[PDB]
């Protein structure tokens with residue numbers, strides 16, 4: 053089954069794209085929780101981190117390196133926070149794996 | 165074997181921690197000030213001070229930390245969900261300068277995530 057992030061990948065609805073490569077896409081979150089807030093997602097449809105397999109390991113890694121590179125290109129030099137949410141306790145909204153990256157203000161602890 | 169931080173001492177077994185999993189690239193253990201009914205860390209044995217200075221060939225390793233995180237989550241019973249977090253720098257609230265992934269669950273996590 054398909055999601056909104058699928059449509060973003062297929063270019064079927066607009067998003068402000070920060071970065072794209074053959075295996076992932078980064079773009080601005082539509083409901084930002086920080087002055088800068090974006091997502092990195094994989095093009096491959098993994099519905100959630102709990103069902104990712106051991107050979108997805110390079111791809112998940114790639115999402116984080118892309119995250120921190122986009123963070124640096126977006127001027128986030130005081131810091132940032134990355135998050136991945138799983139399932140209803142973790143507050144996962146879209147069932148296509150994704151990495152949040154937030155910064156531009158002081159983040160607080162605990163993180164939800 | 166792991167750096168001049170507290171996490172290094174954990175890695176070298178110089179101070180105790182409640183270890184959940186260990187392999188040649190990484191170590192997961194229970195956070196000492198838990199912010200959730202289950203709260204642990206996954207760290208790499210390699211000393212990377214923070215995610216901002218990780219290099220392109222660390223990619224497989226950062227991956228591995230997440231796959232361990234989620235394996236451990238499943239072994240610890242966290243089948244309703246959980247949250248993974250990496251902090252970078254002072255805005256991100258990082259304070260041990262050795263890269264680490266938090267994993268939290270056992271209750272409803274909130275938005276925004278700090």
Ligand SMILES: Nc1ncnc2c1ncn2[C@@H]1O[C@H](CCO[P@@](=O)(S)OC[C@H](O)CO[P@](=O)(S)OC[C@H]2O[C@@H](n3cnc4c(N)ncnc43)[C@H](O)[C@@H]2O)[C@@H](O)[C@H]1O
Nearest residue numbers: 170179180181193194195196197198257258259260261264
């Ligand atoms: N020993 C440990 N075992 C398991 N988990 C641990 C741990 N030490 C920290 N953690 C976990 O890392 C997580 C956060 C990642 O690290 P942070 O950078 S965001 O903050 C924790 C760190 O301890 C902050 O240091 P700081 O707040 S400036 O402490 C002030 C001084 O107290 C010292 N100190 C800390 N723990 C101890 C201690 N157990 N005995 C003596 N001195 C200590 C420390 O060396 C420093 O000079 C926390 O949730 C925490 O529960």
